[PDB]
Amino acid sequence: MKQYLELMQKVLDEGTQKNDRTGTGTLSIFGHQMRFNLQDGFPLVTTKRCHLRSIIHELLWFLQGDTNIAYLHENNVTIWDEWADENGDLGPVYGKQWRAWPTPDGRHIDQITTVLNQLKNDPDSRRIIVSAWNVGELDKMALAPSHAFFQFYVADGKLSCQLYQRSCDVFLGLPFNIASYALLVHMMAQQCDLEVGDFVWTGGDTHLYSNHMDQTHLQLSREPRPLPKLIIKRKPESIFDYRFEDFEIEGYDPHPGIKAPVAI
Amino acid sequence: MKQYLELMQKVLDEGTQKNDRTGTGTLSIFGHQMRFNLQDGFPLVTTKRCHLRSIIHELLWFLQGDTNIAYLHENNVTIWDEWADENGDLGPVYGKQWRAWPTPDGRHIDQITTVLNQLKNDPDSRRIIVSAWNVGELDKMALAPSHAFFQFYVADGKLSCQLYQRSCDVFLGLPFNIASYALLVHMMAQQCDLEVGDFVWTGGDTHLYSNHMDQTHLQLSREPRPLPKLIIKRKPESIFDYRFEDFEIEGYDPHPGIKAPVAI
Ligand SMILES: Nc1nc(=O)c2c([nH]1)NCC(CNc1ccc(C(=O)N[C@@H](CCC(=O)O)C(=O)O)cc1)=N2
Numbered sequence: 001m002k003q004y005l006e007l008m009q010k011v012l013d014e015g016t017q018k019n020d021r022t023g024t025g026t027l028s029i030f031g032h033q034m035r036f037n038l039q040d041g042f043p044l045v046t047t048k049r050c051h052l053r054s055i056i057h058e059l060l061w062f063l064q065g066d067t068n069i070a071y072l073h074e075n076n077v078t079i080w081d082e083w084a085d086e087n088g089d090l091g092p093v094y095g096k097q098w099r100a101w102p103t104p105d106g107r108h109i110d111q112i113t114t115v116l117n118q119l120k121n122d123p124d125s126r127r128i129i130v131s132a133w134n135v136g137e138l139d140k141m142a143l144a145p146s147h148a149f150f151q152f153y154v155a156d157g158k159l160s161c162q163l164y165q166r167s168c169d170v171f172l173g174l175p176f177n178i179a180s181y182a183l184l185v186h187m188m189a190q191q192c193d194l195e196v197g198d199f200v201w202t203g204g205d206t207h208l209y210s211n212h213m214d215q216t217h218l219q220l221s222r223e224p225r226p227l228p229k230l231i232i233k234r235k236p237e238s239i240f241d242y243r244f245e246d247f248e249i250e251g252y253d254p255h256p257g258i259k260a261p262v263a264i
Numbered sequence: 265m266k267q268y269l270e271l272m273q274k275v276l277d278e279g280t281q282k283n284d285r286t287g288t289g290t291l292s293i294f295g296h297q298m299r300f301n302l303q304d305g306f307p308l309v310t311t312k313r314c315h316l317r318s319i320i321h322e323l324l325w326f327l328q329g330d331t332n333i334a335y336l337h338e339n340n341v342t343i344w345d346e347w348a349d350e351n352g353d354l355g356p357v358y359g360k361q362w363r364a365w366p367t368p369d370g371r372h373i374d375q376i377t378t379v380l381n382q383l384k385n386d387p388d389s390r391r392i393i394v395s396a397w398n399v400g401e402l403d404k405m406a407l408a409p410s411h412a413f414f415q416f417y418v419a420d421g422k423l424s425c426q427l428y429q430r431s432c433d434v435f436l437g438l439p440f441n442i443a444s445y446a447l448l449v450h451m452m453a454q455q456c457d458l459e460v461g462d463f464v465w466t467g468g469d470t471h472l473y474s475n476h477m478d479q480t481h482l483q484l485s486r487e488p489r490p491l492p493k494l495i496i497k498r499k500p501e502s503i504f505d506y507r508f509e510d511f512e513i514e515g516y517d518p519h520p521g522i523k524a525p526v527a528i
């Protein structure tokens with residue numbers, strides 16, 4: 001996509017070589033924002049083939065409040081394998097904070113049900129937020145939340161969402177993260193009877209890993225194709241009842257996939 | 265400042281009329297980002313006089329972990345009066361989350377000391393974050409955290425910081441919020457022996473209140489003056505030992521102040 005290839009080029013032209021946690025090394029910039037009008041098409045990268053199966057099942061797993069990778073394995077999705085322990089656990093990452101944030105006094109808060117109630121009863125609220133950055137449980141998480149905090153906004157009957165992503169692997173992570181949150185906005189808009197507005201992505205440390213440079217130059221030579229259209233075939237009873245089969249991505253015709261190593 | 269007056273104009277040209285919590289009504293946009301290179305000057309608005317006394321003491325109060333307004337009153341700062349209860353309490357807002365985030369198992373986490381330790385021992389970390397959005401205590405807070413989440417970044421010996429502000433009163437709140445966080449970056453950089461880099465401000469619902477329109481048009485006719493220079497006269501033993509007298513803002517010569525009503 002235009003916005004995405006502009007960011008890849010910006011990291012190549014402006015990024016600082018930086019060491020990182022994995023020992024791979026990165027070219028890095030800090031602070032970037034891009035906006036996707038979801039009315040223009042579903043923002044799935046076309047200059048390389050993205051594995052939709054992994055994107056959709058990872059979002060359905062988050063909405064279940066699940067942090068064990070068994071569900072992903074049942075559905076042949078292996079993207080979280082390298083961080084899980086012997087029992088397949090990841091600790092209280094995304095799904096657990098979204099669905100069951102533990103309070104100091106022992107209660108659990110379901111942020112997704114809270115957001116539904118706010119969108120249905122107080123759409124003008126400036127407080128419609130979900131946060132996975134639970135400071136008191138960071139030490140139990142396999143990987144600290146990268147897409148950490150997001151906010152919904154309603155104006156003129158359209159639902160928008162902004163994500164703050166503290167750390168962004170531009171070649172591998174970001175195509176998945178954009179499609180995942182664009183999908184959640186479509187689901188939320190359908191459940192609340194709203195039209196989809198904008199998805200606003202904001203990044204903190206936005207980086208290309210040093211061993212993704214050949215793949216980056218290859219993808220940068222490709223022309224973006226027309227964005228596909230997302231079709232949700234059914235309106236489930238709730239946001240927690242969607243099924244993989246309910247989604248149709250129409251007209252997706254990408255350039256070939258480009259493999260790249262994951263930095264662990 | 266150039267960036268600030270460009271945002272005011274953008275809200276006037278592109279904002280949607282929106283109802284809000286206070287009943288005042290706003291012109292609102294969602295998702296904006298601006299960057300201030302702190303090497304260019306201290307980003308204190310010059311097209312209206314800002315009350316530095318309130319800005320500096322509010323930051324020192326946050327760093328103490330204090331949420332009762334008595335300290336502010338001792339220093340003749342009245343900006344939080346309308347939200348405090350009979351005992352002057354605001355509930356577990358900013359200072360308390362920054363200095364003593366309560367964990368599910370009863371521990372308290374001092375995020376500021378954690379950040380100091382990360383900047384001193386692992387400056388390349390992509391996880392150097394402070395969050396005031398504590399989901400399990402939102403219901404005890406007088407006002408939900410508006411400047412909610414921020415991240416530090418170190419590259420080429422320079423310290424940068426990005427703030428996610430979920431809700432932004434452009435005329436009253438934002439001049440104070442920009443100066444406050446720019447001041448914290450200078451303090452952190454001095455304590456860690458770094459140069460100051462960029463302050464990146466990212467907003468969610470960014471708005472002008474309907475009864476600030478005359479004040480906005482007046483300020484938009486003024487030309488920005490040169491930015492002042494911040495001088496910290498002393499290096500305290502720690503980030504918690506700064507005093508009001510340690511700060512000097514040199515060459516601040518603003519246009520006259522513009523009064524405007526606060527929406528409660
Ligand atoms: N270094 C790093 N970058 C990541 O983006 C990342 C990470 N670490 N930690 C875990 C994680 C979880 N999400 C993801 C997303 C995509 C792939 C991935 O390897 N995608 C490949 C193959 C997809 C497949 O399994 O079919 C791709 O080519 O997109 C891995 C993990 N993301």
Ligand SMILES: Nc1nc(=O)c2c([nH]1)NCC(CNc1ccc(C(=O)N[C@@H](CCC(=O)O)C(=O)O)cc1)=N2
Pocket residue numbers: 314315318342343344407433436437438440522523524526527528
């Ligand atoms: N509607 C709203 N907007 C705010 O920016 C705001 C709020 N509510 N809730 C509390 C709060 C706390 N921060 C602030 C910042 C500035 C002023 C204020 O009134 N500033 C005036 C006078 C400063 C003074 O007391 O000397 C100004 O003209 O800047 C109030 C509260 N900020």
Ligand SMILES: Cc1cn([C@H]2C[C@H](O)[C@@H](COP(=O)(O)O)O2)c(=O)[nH]c1=O
Pocket residue numbers: 021143144146147167168169170172173174177390391
């Ligand atoms: C989980 C996840 C990680 N990442 C990234 C960002 C970093 O490259 C790495 C996480 O490492 P970090 O915790 O040191 O920042 O994986 C994404 O880009 N998207 C994701 O969804």
Ligand SMILES: Cc1cn([C@H]2C[C@H](O)[C@@H](COP(=O)(O)O)O2)c(=O)[nH]c1=O
Pocket residue numbers: 126127285407408410411431432433434436437438441
């Ligand atoms: C505390 C604080 C509030 N605000 C704002 C944003 C909103 O106008 C209002 C808070 O209301 P809200 O919680 O309904 O968003 O005050 C700032 O802009 N800066 C601040 O530091």
